[PDB]
Amino acid sequence: MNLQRFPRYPLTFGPTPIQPLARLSKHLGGKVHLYAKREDCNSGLAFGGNKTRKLEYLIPEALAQGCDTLVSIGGIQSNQTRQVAAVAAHLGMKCVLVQENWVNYSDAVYDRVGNIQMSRILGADVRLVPDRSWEDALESVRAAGGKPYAIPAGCSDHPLGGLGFVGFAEEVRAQEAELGFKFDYVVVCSVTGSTQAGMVVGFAADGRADRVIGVDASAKPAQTREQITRIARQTAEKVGLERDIMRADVVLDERFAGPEYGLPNEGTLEAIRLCARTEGMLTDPVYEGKSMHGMIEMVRNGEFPEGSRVLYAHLGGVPALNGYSFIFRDG
Amino acid sequence: MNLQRFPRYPLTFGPTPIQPLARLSKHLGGKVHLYAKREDCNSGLAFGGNKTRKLEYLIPEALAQGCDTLVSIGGIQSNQTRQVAAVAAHLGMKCVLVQENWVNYSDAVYDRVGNIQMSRILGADVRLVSWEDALESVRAAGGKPYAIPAGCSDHPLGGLGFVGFAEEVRAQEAELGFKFDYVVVCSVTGSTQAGMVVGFAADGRADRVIGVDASAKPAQTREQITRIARQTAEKVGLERDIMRADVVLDERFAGPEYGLPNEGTLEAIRLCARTEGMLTDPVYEGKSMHGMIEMVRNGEFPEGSRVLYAHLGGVPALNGYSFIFRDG
Amino acid sequence: MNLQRFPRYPLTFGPTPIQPLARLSKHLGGKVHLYAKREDCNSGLAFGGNKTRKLEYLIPEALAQGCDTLVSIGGIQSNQTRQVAAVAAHLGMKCVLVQENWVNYSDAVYDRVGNIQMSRILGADVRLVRSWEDALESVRAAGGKPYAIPAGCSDHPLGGLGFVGFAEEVRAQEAELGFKFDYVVVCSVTGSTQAGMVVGFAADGRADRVIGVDASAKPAQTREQITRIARQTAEKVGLERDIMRADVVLDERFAGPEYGLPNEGTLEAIRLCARTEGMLTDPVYEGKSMHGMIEMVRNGEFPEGSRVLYAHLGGVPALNGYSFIFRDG
Amino acid sequence: MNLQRFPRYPLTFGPTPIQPLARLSKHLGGKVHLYAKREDCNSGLAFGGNKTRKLEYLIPEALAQGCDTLVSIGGIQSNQTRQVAAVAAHLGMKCVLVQENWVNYSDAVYDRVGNIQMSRILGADVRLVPDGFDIGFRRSWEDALESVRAAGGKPYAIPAGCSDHPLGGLGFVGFAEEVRAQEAELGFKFDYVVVCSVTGSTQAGMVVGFAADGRADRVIGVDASAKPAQTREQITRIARQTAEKVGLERDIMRADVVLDERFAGPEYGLPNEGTLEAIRLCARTEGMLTDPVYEGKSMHGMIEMVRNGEFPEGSRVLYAHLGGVPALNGYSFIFRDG
């Protein structure tokens, strides 16, 4: 393949480090070696995270087309919109964000702390849909005399939204060369799908596509699974994967998404605590805590072969913790 | 000097990056070149920050001393205690934190979001109110406590971390092929600027370290920086005395109190966040940011200067001031 | 029957007023006349409400026994525990409250606003979680004598008396008014409110005109408690009938989705009532009974010309714990 | 004096009760007898309070003029706007509330609990401007009034706290009236009255009311504005205008207006440590709550006045509880442990 064909706008510090989770690994029995690749520490732009890696391949186009405003969308505590806001400010672009009530949660400061607080501080025009906003948002930009660059949910369903994480696999191989071994599995939280899609494509290149273990956080597996597949095939062709993405190449575990998107279950909370207390690494109740829950449970259930080396991709999301303060009042 | 005689326990990803603040620089006239060294992005341990760089020289001693519990203290939205909680969990140690009511601020979730929320998730014993009664607590419980003062500052090793910072900067200026004429840094408990004063004294730039007070008690802070600088310069073999001239502390941006932002703080936070995508907080960094911007604006920095802003972290505290930024 | 037998400690301003809800009545078709009896405005003690009327019959005993501490229990936003805290302060007694999380809710200020905030200001020892037995024992082991007050004062011998009087009161008022109400709508969760009413209205044969509207979301259990308490009560005041299960009417249609959580209908009802009458209701209790009364009138479940008396039991302070839901009204 | 000349629209349950504060009295020395008239329990419309008494005399006019919208204004936790919202809904009128943060305070749920929360549920159009807006500067008040017109309605203007309005002092003239009657049952006259003052027509009505029987200077106003001179002058002026309005056969002397300044700090909307001890002491002895903004400050006043012996031994003091309790929700951090 050839990802280098597409320009990359630097928004990150550089390759993201991989760190062993030896304490958590031991705590779990020492049979499986757990690691984490820190995407959540990839940037100086309002904490960055996985979406910022994706944005690197979209920005060149936005600039090429002469756009002056980045428009995007997501829930109240969306990480995507905050990163779009930081990237826009950094680039000297305006930013319009459509924030919808994507979650059945009604915390007193849900819309005033965490991610959305930063978006407003970063100067984005943050629009709360009542209670098409998207098209109104795009048009309002034109009417203003601007030129909007449309960034869909999570940057996923976009021609360029999968390039980012092909590069991720590209990084992992380079790091595997220094480590002298290959990771047996990758655990990643999936919702809008282009993170896992990029990974699927990137690891298909060396036959590990089916080793990318996605953990659904959407609580709507079928739609998510379908979107990962579609985006992966599309990206595969965009980069030249000398192989095809089969349906069996997309692995999406649906056991840890409950009860709904944006709501943690008790295992989510346990995992967040276990991981935080054994490694000093925080995860959130919406996304990462669920993929962490999955990984630990998998290890716990012996689903990972003794001796395996599992690479947990930490995608970011921690600032959303602020919207669930009551759950963690006593820790 | 020889900082190497002191062991450093890795808690960071490595040297922190230096970024150009081209947009902000251009916004302010283009006569002064602003940069930022991201101490706020130095670790995977709950966001890290300046305190984490300090703890790298304290941890070896706690370990040497066979301690099993880290003990520290700070205000409710303290960044110090959150970093101790993370470093501890990472190291497999217990953690007791004394969170005092250090700010005359009244907010509904002040003790449930941001820094303190993380410390609890991280497993720390968070006690709201002192220092002694706590340490003794661990002893009485049968554990060996490692006492860590506010900001890791007033401690024999509290100044080493930032002596290393000046060292790092020297290597980066070498790679860059140019030198920074000044550094702007926020000062409250002191060892951050003190380590800096010692490290830059080494190459005659101690007076180029422009501290910005955020304590609102500039005299004590100034005296504490100086004291710690003197002790640290002795620790590392600095071949010279630290004079009053080497300790520069601006007092103009601390208002109105510690933990409380003024309107200049707020404007600085917004300007910096909207020109660079880089966030700062109402307690500490927003004030040093305010200070730096004002300085450039007043023309206090010779035209052509390259100023290195040290971003110490502190962003999570933003959550405790939600009402103020409700509309931006 | 003979309620007068039992001593009532004054904690209220006196009988509660009954107001017409002309606007709400006209709005829903004018076919049914709605009124409200304001138990929510019955006392100067931290807003009071139905529980305070119940407490008038319990306090004499606590005093007779020489108890020095009132101990009680409820969820984080319990109205009962706040009224107990207020009565205590007033009486010069200590107060220990067992606050449990009875609701699958997690709002950021849930445990710092409304009812629980008032109990802490009123001087109560608010304990956030054998929970209850431990509290009672702790008071003893502290050298004090605790007077036990079960959830909502309901499962207590004297807990059903307060509302037998409610029925006494309504009769006196219907006299002054020169007419009688065909129904009473009341929210029911722990039970002694409707039980007291059932007993009191059986006295003149209207027990089954008391339409209880469940807010527990466990109607079988609540229905049984109202039954059980009304029986222990109709017997204590010497009613000349045994309370029949058919005397206990309890609609289960409006308690959804869980106790402590409103459904879309609850919200609409709170807004309609508030916007036509200027009378507020909460999402835990009264909003649900209000939702029921409105739905009943809208479905024609009340025969034309009927005069319905809605008993407003209090609970408004709890609104503060559901701030996100009402951010725009 | 002839208050009966002006119509009054019932918005309250009837005369408000007077309760003895025996435990608090005993606790302070027993040397002074404190009582309290519950204006705070005066209505079924969203907890009512002193402003609702004032409103009974304004509504007839609004109705006589055929207005269909009530327009008012106040800070975020204003008790005034919440009562206007409840009265409007109760009458079948629309309501526009112009609001802005009038306090140097910024609690996380300040604009979403307590008073303002109720106004929104009550169906009022709550126009809350962002910081820096300055409604007083732009004159948002007037724009709100025109917007109603331009919209096809007829607004009835209700100034901050109902105070600086031709009928705003009437309500509390009636209060002195009520007090006389009730004193006629007690068989004794209260030697003093303690009342919290900010926009002034509460105390103003009382001054006019008690002037009629020579006790104007017995109305001990306690400033909650932290801007005593302006408040004092507003009371005096409103009193004189109201006296003339109701036929008082007297000239209100500067000496008839008493406004203590010692308990208003540090600013309007912020409690001092004294305010807090006062709220807690009164709550823990009587089960009667008061707030960090208004009532808690006058309660702190009465208590301090008694403790200091500024009240002659044997004196009977009538504390007027104006309401405001819902505002406590906006100060949860301060009361997190009580």
Ligand SMILES: *Cc1c(COP(=O)(O)O)cnc(C)c1O
């Ligand atoms: C967006 C996001 C995800 C899921 O990534 P997708 O590409 O949408 O599948 C997981 N974790 C975090 C923290 C995110 O922000």
Ligand SMILES: *Cc1c(COP(=O)(O)O)cnc(C)c1O
């Ligand atoms: C602790 C801290 C400071 C001040 O550092 P000192 O060494 O105590 O002077 C500045 N900024 C942030 C974000 C901090 O956490």
Ligand SMILES: *Cc1c(COP(=O)(O)O)cnc(C)c1O
């Ligand atoms: C307790 C309560 C109820 C239900 O009364 P029960 O006697 O427990 O059935 C209804 N409304 C409010 C406001 C309450 O506090």
Ligand SMILES: *Cc1c(COP(=O)(O)O)cnc(C)c1O
């Ligand atoms: C408005 C108000 C006051 C002060 O009354 P003014 O007539 O404006 O002087 C005092 N207490 C409460 C609770 C209020 O709402």
